[PDB]
Amino acid sequence: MRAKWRKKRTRRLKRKRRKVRARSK
Amino acid sequence: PKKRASNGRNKKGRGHVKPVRCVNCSKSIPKDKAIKRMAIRNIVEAAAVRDLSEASVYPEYALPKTYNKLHYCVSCAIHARIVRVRSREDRKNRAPP
Amino acid sequence: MENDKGQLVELYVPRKCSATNRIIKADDHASVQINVAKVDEEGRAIPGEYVTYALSGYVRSRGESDDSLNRLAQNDGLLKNVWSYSR
Amino acid sequence: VLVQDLLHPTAASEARKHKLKTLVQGPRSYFLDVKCPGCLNITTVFSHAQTAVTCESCSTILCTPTGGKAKLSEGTSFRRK
Amino acid sequence: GKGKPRGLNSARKLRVHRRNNRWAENNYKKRLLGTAFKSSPFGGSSHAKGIVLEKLGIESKQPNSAIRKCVRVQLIKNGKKVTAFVPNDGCLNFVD
Amino acid sequence: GWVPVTKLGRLVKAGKITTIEEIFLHSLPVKEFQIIDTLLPGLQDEVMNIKPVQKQTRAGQRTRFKAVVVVGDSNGHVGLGIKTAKEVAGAIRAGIIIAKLSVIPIRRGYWGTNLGQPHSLATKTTGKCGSVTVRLIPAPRGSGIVASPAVKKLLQLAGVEDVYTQSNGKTRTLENTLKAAFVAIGNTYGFLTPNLWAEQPLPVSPLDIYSDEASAQ
Amino acid sequence: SLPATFDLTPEDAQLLLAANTHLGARNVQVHQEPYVFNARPDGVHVINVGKTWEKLVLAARIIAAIPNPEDVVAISSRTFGQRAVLKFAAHTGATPIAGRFTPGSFTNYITRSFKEPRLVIVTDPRSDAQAIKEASYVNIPVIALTDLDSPSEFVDVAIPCNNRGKHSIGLIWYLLAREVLRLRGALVDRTQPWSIMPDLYFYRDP
Amino acid sequence: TRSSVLADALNAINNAEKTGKRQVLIRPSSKVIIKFLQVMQKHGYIGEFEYIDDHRSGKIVVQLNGRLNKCGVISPRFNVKIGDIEKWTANLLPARQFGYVILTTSAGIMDHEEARRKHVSGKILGFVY
Amino acid sequence: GRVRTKTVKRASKALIERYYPKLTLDFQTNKRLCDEIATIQSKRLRNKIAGYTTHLMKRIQKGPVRGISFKLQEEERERKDQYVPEVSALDLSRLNVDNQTSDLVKSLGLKLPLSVINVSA
RNA sequence: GAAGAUGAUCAGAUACCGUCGUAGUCUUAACCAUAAACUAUGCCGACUAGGGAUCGGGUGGUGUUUUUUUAAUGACCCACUCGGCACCUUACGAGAAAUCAAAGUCUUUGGGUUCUGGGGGGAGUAUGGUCGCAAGGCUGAAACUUAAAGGAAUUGACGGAA
Ligand SMILES: [Mg+2]
Ligand SMILES: [Mg+2]
Ligand SMILES: [Mg+2]
Ligand SMILES: [Mg+2]
Ligand SMILES: [Mg+2]
Ligand SMILES: [Mg+2]
Ligand SMILES: [Mg+2]
Ligand SMILES: [Mg+2]
Ligand SMILES: [Mg+2]
Ligand SMILES: [Mg+2]
Ligand SMILES: [Mg+2]
Ligand SMILES: [Mg+2]
């Protein structure tokens, strides 16, 4: 697992997490 | 670790050089790094000189030359056997042959 | 070094470099000792009697053994006009 | 050289060294008694003189400034100090 | 100048710098956050009584191959569930 | 003695050089262990560690055995020898030879008062090998050797009675630790104290005095 | 301490000037700058032959102080000094190593070529670097026939001469042999010249 | 920038003594440098030293004889009570029988031994051994 | 594939080293005396050693061979290297001297017959 | 030329390769504030070793070229010097080594100062604050888990490397 692409995976996880957090709030 | 003191290139005091393109694959490689061979050939052959001079007007014409500075990238030069990977003690040699 | 009753306890007082005054120690294998022959009247050698210089390995490995020996030979009169103090 | 005289270095070495890096730093510049072909008077001009120096009576440029020493111009004569 | 300040009046910079870099230790971080009381089931204590809920048999890690014969214990003082190894031959026959 | 090559051996095993301090004063290189055997007959030996060192082969892992041996009488001399060989007995037998050839003098002194017969070192000394730094500090009477049980054994075979030790680096590497301590007790004559400041008349080597007895035909 | 005769005689000056022993290297080592006298245009420096003779006499005094004479080992790896070393060997005691040095000669006590000199003289500290390096392991003083560019690393008595020419090398070895024999007393009187004339020390072809 | 001319001077002395030179040149030659060198010369660690007076700050040529191992500067000049001179000597000096810790004391710049004989103490400059 | 091993070449070298007032350029004479001066364990090895000895003797007869060190070769090389030319180089055949070398002579305080030529840079 | 379209190949259906082509590449006004932003080497100062080559400036040759009967200025040569980008040899020294004239002047430990790191993951994550139009940037844990992860080099093996 390239650290660049794992970073991009976690960056997409950031977007999904703040999307569902703004959905609830 | 540091395989080369001049890291792979010739950049001491710039920060940026410019990129050129490889002649074999058009990779963007820096101009100091690239690998640069001047191809100066005759315009005909090593063998067709007799034919052209025999079937030429203007006796002893010029036998003109063609000139082409070729920029390679490292992968293309190694594959085309232009630089040909060296030993640890011998890669410090900067002599042209 | 001595104890309180005199009685030097050294085992061996080491030699010193004639140039840099460092101790020449027992495994300083680059250090040399040069004996220059004492020349009498009408230029013989006097076998046995020397002018002795000890040079440490540091001086020789830094290349100043020749110039140091020029200085210490001229100070003892073995040379006349070789070493000059003001370079 | 591992042993040398630093109080009395040779004059050939001190004349080679930089003006700040000698034993005592002093200038290598000098002054010049300069006279024109025309006027009889004498002007004291610096060596590295930075200025188009004229006489008080002259209208004539004695030296032209350059990067180092001033170039003494136009056939004028000079003497040191 | 080997990193750190050295001057006679530079004791506050040295003291606060040691205080700041002191947090990278495991024990100082743990002791000043007080994680033994917030977490770590025995609340800073050595021993704790609990009540067995069920006997477990834990698979041992590779390359070992055994059943480890533990119990699931609910602590009286917290209510926290832990797993505790019954540490001799037999001895799971002794608990309940 | 035993048909010596090396002029120093032809002098020592004939009887012209009788003390090992005559060798150490002129820094004469010792290339035969029987020189040290004659000049220091009470030179006890201690193997400190046997370890196997392996080289990966085209098929297999060939191993040799590497021995560290500290020799030295407890009156001011040690040698540390390290030798690897196919068998452990050959490793000991040749490491004793290398440790005998590597005999150096140490400078015992005082923690400080000149009340007789030196017990400690004369100076804080240090030595490095690899990452390991070993520092030896003069210690008062009755302190003993405050050192790890290998450096302590080397200093016991040096005749050091009292010394303190600091150590840095990976001291579990016994070869580097023993070589660092060996360099450190070699540096005691490396240091120039004020009692050694006196000018000495720079004597003649025994190879020059007894030049007839050396270089035999 | 050398009374009056050990001054550079004008006949010896004729020899040293005629053999071009005063033609130093274009590049001068910082340790050999004492021996330079006023470099000429074209860049060739001039070796002070008075100091060359004084260092030669000092080297001869050091050679004629080893008691037995067969452990003053004379080294030449160079063709211009092979014959000079061999004739120095024949005239003085002087164990020669003319040709290849065979490393492990001063260390490595079980070889056939194991020697222990009390003094090593080398023709060239560049080409004879193995002899100087190996003499740096077993406490051996080194006299070298240095030029102005040759290194003085582990060289204790540097006789400044021209290393490029064969006449300079053969003459300096000839003069060193002559002064060693005069100090030993094998040559009776310092004023009369040696009957051995300096051309049996030069390299020849054929 | 230049913050300690004594540290620069003593560094130059150490660097020439390590490489075996018999002399240094020191710029820019303070009174603390002159007094430190006078203590070292009194105890035999250097020879004659000579102050070149240019009209700016002075230079010094010290004649190093052979007998110096390490002269150094303890910067900052710590306040040193009379009870903890011996911590400083046990830390900086190779043995109890030689080596001197130089103190700036209100009775003058002096080593620790005749700071003890005068029963005075103060700031620490450095050491010589 | 006629390369000779070290047990042939070393033995032949030692035989020339200690028996040069002996064995000649003839293989049969060398073969017959290799039976008496040496104990070679087989006839083929004796013939190989004697043939290599013959080859090296025929080689020595036109110029010497390195590695062979017998007592006669030292003496003939020394009487060949004892040549002294009577044309006497380093003698004054006219002393061509430069200007700085004349200054060197004057600084040394000696009187020499010189001949100064200007040097172009 | 990201995306996207399409042509081939591939066991799965090699994303490589071919032809197009949006955003983009360029510019103006405003944002962003990150790069293997690297010399993976903070900034100031001192000392320690030889060397040649080069860039900028300066100084000196009764030097070469403009030979025109004691031939300006430029260009060049030689020697110094200051400042710079670097380089070669050595290892005094340093380093775990690779290597380093600094990564030296360090257990003989202190020239001045700022920033950072404390086993590997979890994790540059959660949350809070703040900045941004957004993308995100700066700041930034813990629970839990783990006996190694890693660095340099040696021998072997292997290479669709020579
Ligand atoms: Mg790699
Ligand atoms: Mg960049
Ligand atoms: Mg530790
Ligand atoms: Mg960043
Ligand atoms: Mg970085
Ligand atoms: Mg800054
Ligand atoms: Mg420069
Ligand atoms: Mg961590
Ligand atoms: Mg962050
Ligand atoms: Mg957030
Ligand atoms: Mg990494
Ligand atoms: Mg690795």
**Which chain E residue lies closest to H7 (C-alpha atoms)?**
E1
**C86 interfacial to chain D (CB closer than 8 Å):** yes
The distance of Cα B49 from the centroid of its chain, to the nearest Å, equals 25
Contact H54 D24 (CB under 8 A): yes
Sign of CA dihedral G186, G189, G195, G201: positive
Q: For Cα atoms I31, I37, I42, give the angle at the middle one, nearest 5 degrees.
A: 55
Q: Which of F115, F114, F119 is nearest to F75 (CA)?
A: F119
Peptide bond preceding G10: is omega within 30 degrees of 0, i.e. cis?
Answer: no
Nucleotide with C1' nearest the H88 CA: J110
Exposure on the CB side of residue H5, measured as CA atoms within 13 A = 16
* Distance of alpha carbon H7 from alpha carbon H73, whole angstroms: 6
Task: Specify whether the CB–CB gap between B29 and B19 falls below 8 A.
Answer: yes
Shortest distance between the Cα of F103 and any Cα of chain H, in A, equals 25
Q: Tokens 């018999």 — which residue?
A: H22
Residue E3 structure tokens: 């990193």
Task: Specify whether the CB–CB gap between F196 and H97 falls below 8 A.
Answer: no
Q: Which of G4, G5, G3 is nearest to G178 (CA)?
A: G5
Q: Å resolution of this model? A: 3.0
Strands of F72-162 (E only): list them.
77-85, 104-105, 108-109, 120-121, 125-129, 132-138, 145-146
Q: Taking the CB of residue I26, how many other CB atoms lie within 10 A of it? A: 13
Q: Which conformational region is residue F208 in: left (phi greater than 0), alpha (psi within -120 to 50 degrees), or beta?
A: alpha
Same domain, H46 and H79: no
H46 three-class SS: coil
Alpha-helical regions (H) of F78-173: 88-101, 151-156
**Which chain H residue lies closest to F135 (C-alpha atoms)?**
H94
* Distance of alpha carbon G196 from alpha carbon G91, whole angstroms: 10
Which residues lie below 8 Å from residue I1, measured CB to CB, with a gap of 6+? Answer: none
**DSSP per residue over D25-78, as a string?**
------EEEEE-SS----EEEESS--S-EE-SS--SEEEE--SSS-EE-TT-EE
Residue G202 structure tokens: 């030069």
**Domain assignments of chain F as residue spans, ordered by start:** 7-104, 108-196
Which residues lie below 8 Å from residue D4, measured CB to CB, with a gap of 6+? Answer: C85, C86, C87, H23
Q: Into which CATH architecture does domain F108-196 fall?
A: 2-Layer Sandwich (3.30)
β-strands E70-75, E81-85 pairing: antiparallel
* Distance of alpha carbon C35 from alpha carbon F29, whole angstroms: 19
Q: Tokens 């040290």 — which residue?
A: F36
Contact G62 C77 (CB under 8 A): no
Q: Which of G15, G1, G2 is nearest to G193 (CA)?
A: G15
Q: Tell me, what amino acid is at G149?
A: D
Q: For Cα atoms B63, B69, B75, give the angle at the middle one, nearest 5 degrees.
A: 130
Shortest distance between the Cα of F122 and any Cα of chain H, in A, equals 7
Distances from the Cα of E41 to the Cα of E27, E46, E76, angstroms: 17, 11, 11
* Distance of alpha carbon G106 from alpha carbon G130, whole angstroms: 10
* Distance of alpha carbon H26 from alpha carbon E30, whole angstroms: 53
Task: Specify whether the CB–CB gap between C53 and G160 falls below 8 A.
Answer: no
Whose CA is nearest the C1' atom of nucleotide J89? G151
Task: Specify whether the CB–CB gap between B10 and B33 falls below 8 A.
Answer: yes
D67 touches strand J (CB under 7 A): yes
Q: Which of F133, F139, F135 is nearest to F121 (CA)?
A: F139
Residue D23: exposure state from Cβ atoms within 10 A (0-12, 13-18, ≥19): middle
Alpha-helical regions (H) of chain H: 5-18, 31-42, 85-92, 113-116
Q: Which residues of H touch F111 (CB under 8 A)?
A: 96
C-alpha F173 to ligand 12 mean position (Å): 20
* Distance of alpha carbon F52 from alpha carbon G37, whole angstroms: 63
Length in residues, chain D? 81
* I20 phi and psi angles, rounded to 5 deg: -70, -35
Task: Specify whether the CB–CB gap between G160 and G24 falls below 8 A.
Answer: yes
* F129 phi and psi angles, rounded to 5 deg: -145, 120
B11 touches strand J (CB under 7 A): yes
Q: Which of F115, F192, F203 sits opposite C4 (nearest CB)?
A: F115
**Which chain F residue lies closest to H44 (C-alpha atoms)?**
F194
* C52 phi and psi angles, rounded to 5 deg: -110, 130
The distance of Cα A16 from the centroid of its chain, to the nearest Å, equals 5
Residue H9 belongs to domain spanning:
1-68
β-strands G157-158, F125-129 pairing: unpaired
Chain F meets chain G (3+ C-beta pairs below 8 A): yes
* Distance of alpha carbon B70 from alpha carbon B38, whole angstroms: 6
Residue B24: exposure state from Cβ atoms within 10 A (0-12, 13-18, ≥19): middle
Residue D80: exposure state from Cβ atoms within 10 A (0-12, 13-18, ≥19): exposed
Residue B44 structure tokens: 């005909």
Chain H meets chain D (3+ C-beta pairs below 8 A): yes
How many helices and strands, by DSSP H and E, does chain F display?
7, 10
Residue G70: exposure state from Cβ atoms within 10 A (0-12, 13-18, ≥19): middle
Task: Specify whether the CB–CB gap between G42 and I121 falls below 8 A.
Answer: yes
Residue I94: exposure state from Cβ atoms within 10 A (0-12, 13-18, ≥19): exposed
**DSSP per residue over G61-119, as a string?**
HHHTTSSSGGGEEEEE-SHHHHHHHHHHHHHSS--EEES---SSSSS-TTSTT----SE
* Distance of alpha carbon E14 from alpha carbon E22, whole angstroms: 12
Task: Specify whether the CB–CB gap between G39 and G45 falls below 8 A.
Answer: yes
Dihedral of the alpha carbons of H1, H2, H7, H9, in degrees to the nearest 10: 130
Distances from the Cα of F52 to the Cα of B4, D66, F61, F83, F98, angstroms: 36, 77, 11, 12, 19
Residues 43-82 of B with CB within 7 A of strand J:
81
Task: Specify whether the CB–CB gap between F44 and F99 falls below 8 A.
Answer: no
* Distance of alpha carbon F130 from alpha carbon F112, whole angstroms: 32
β-strands G119-122, G142-144 pairing: parallel
Task: Specify whether the CB–CB gap between H94 and H66 falls below 8 A.
Answer: no
- Count of domains for chain C: 1
Burial of F62-98, coded b for 16+ CB within 10 Å and e otherwise, reads: eebbbbbbbbbbeebbbbbbbbbbeeeeebbebbbbb
Protein CA A9 to sugar C1' J132 (Å): 22
β-strands G119-122, G72-76 pairing: parallel
**F154 interfacial to chain G (CB closer than 8 Å):** no
Peptide bond preceding E63: is omega within 30 degrees of 0, i.e. cis?
Answer: yes
Residue I35 structure tokens: 């039976």
Protein CA G166 to sugar C1' J68 (Å): 48
Q: Which of I15, I83, I89, I25 is nearest to I54 (CA)?
A: I25
Q: Which of H78, H10, H76 is nearest to H45 (CA)?
A: H10
Task: Specify whether the CB–CB gap between F186 and C27 falls below 8 A.
Answer: yes
C25 touches strand J (CB under 7 A): no
The distance of Cα G7 from the centroid of its chain, to the nearest Å, equals 18
How many helices and strands, by DSSP H and E, does chain H display?
4, 7
* Distance of alpha carbon F120 from alpha carbon F135, whole angstroms: 14
Q: For Cα atoms F145, F151, F152, give the angle at the middle one, nearest 5 degrees.
A: 30
Q: Which residues of H touch D2 (CB under 8 A)?
A: 19-22
The distance of Cα F62 from the centroid of its chain, to the nearest Å, equals 31
Contact F191 H98 (CB under 8 A): no
- Strand-pairing partners, residue C23, are C16
Q: Which of G56, G40, G20 is nearest to G165 (CA)?
A: G20
- Strand-pairing partners, residue F47, are F69
Q: Tell me, what amino acid is at C28?
A: D
Task: Specify whether the CB–CB gap between H37 and H60 falls below 8 A.
Answer: yes
Residue G90 structure tokens: 């024949």
The domain F7-104: what is its CATH number?
A: 3.30.160.20
**Domain assignments of chain G as residue spans, ordered by start:** 12-206
Length in residues, chain B? 97
* Distance of alpha carbon G15 from alpha carbon G8, whole angstroms: 11
- Strand-pairing partners, residue B28, are B21
Task: Specify whether the CB–CB gap between G185 and G71 falls below 8 A.
Answer: no
DSSP 8-state code for residue F192: -
Residue E37 belongs to domain spanning:
1-96
- Strand-pairing partners, residue F46, are F70
Q: Nearest ligand to the C-alpha of residue E23?
A: 8
Chain F meets chain A (3+ C-beta pairs below 8 A): no
Residue E83 structure tokens: 């797993």
Contact C60 G156 (CB under 8 A): yes
DSSP 8-state code for residue G23: B
* Distance of alpha carbon F77 from alpha carbon F74, whole angstroms: 7
Residue B36 structure tokens: 């640069």
**DSSP per residue over H65-77, as a string?**
-S--S-EEE-SS-
Nucleotides in chain J near protein beta carbons (<7 Å): 39-52, 57-60, 63, 77-82, 84-89, 92-100, 103-119, 123-127, 135-136, 142-144, 146-147, 151-153, 155-157, 161-162
Which residues numbered 191-210 in F keep a CB inside 8 Å of some CB on G?
A: 207-208
Helix or strand holding residue H79 (H, E): strand H79-80
DSSP 8-state code for residue B39: E
* Distance of alpha carbon C23 from alpha carbon C12, whole angstroms: 12
**Domain assignments of chain B as residue spans, ordered by start:** 1-97
Q: Which of I15, I29, I7, I105 is nearest to I60 (CA)?
A: I15
Q: Which of F27, F200, F205 sits opposite C26 (nearest CB)?
A: F27
Peptide bond preceding F140: is omega within 30 degrees of 0, i.e. cis?
Answer: no
Q: Which of C7, C27, C54 sits opposite F186 (nearest CB)?
A: C27
Distances from the Cα of F43 to the Cα of F37, F66, F101, angstroms: 7, 21, 12
Q: Which of F140, E85, D76 is nearest to H90 (CA)?
A: F140
Residue F88 structure tokens: 């452990």
Q: How far apart are the first and last CA of chain G?
A: 44
SS (H, E, C) chain C: CEECCEEECCCCCCEECCCCCCEECCCCCCCEEEEEECCCHHHCCCCCCEEEEEECHHHHHCCCHHHHHHHHHHHCCCCCCCCCCCC
SS (H, E, C) chain I: CCCCCHHHHHHHHHHHHHCCCCCCCCHHHHHHHHHHHCCCCCHHHHHHHHHHHHHHHHHHCCCCCCCCCCHHHHHHHHHHHCCCCCCCCCCCCCCEECHHHHHHHHHHCCCCCCEECCCCC
Dihedral of the alpha carbons of E39, E44, E50, E55, in degrees to the nearest 10: 60
Q: Tokens 């001033």 — which residue?
A: D70
Contact C57 G136 (CB under 8 A): yes
Q: Tokens 């004569």 — which residue?
A: D77
Q: Taking the CB of residue I6, how many other CB atoms lie within 10 A of it? A: 8
* Distance of alpha carbon C23 from alpha carbon C26, whole angstroms: 9
Q: Which residues of D touch C19 (CB under 8 A)?
A: 2
Strands of chain B (E only): list them.
19-21, 28-30, 36-42, 65-71
Same domain, H52 and H1: yes
Residue I41 structure tokens: 């364990």
* Distance of alpha carbon C55 from alpha carbon C62, whole angstroms: 12
Residues 60-79 of E with CB within 7 A of strand J:
61
β-strands F60-71, B36-42 pairing: unpaired
Residue E75 structure tokens: 């602590």
Q: Taking the CB of residue H17, how many other CB atoms lie within 10 A of it? A: 24
Exposure on the CB side of residue B47, measured as CA atoms within 13 A = 0
Helix or strand holding residue G160 (H, E): none
Q: Which conformational region is residue F199 in: left (phi greater than 0), alpha (psi within -120 to 50 degrees), or beta?
A: beta
* Distance of alpha carbon H12 from alpha carbon H19, whole angstroms: 11
Q: Nearest ligand to the C-alpha of residue A21?
A: 10
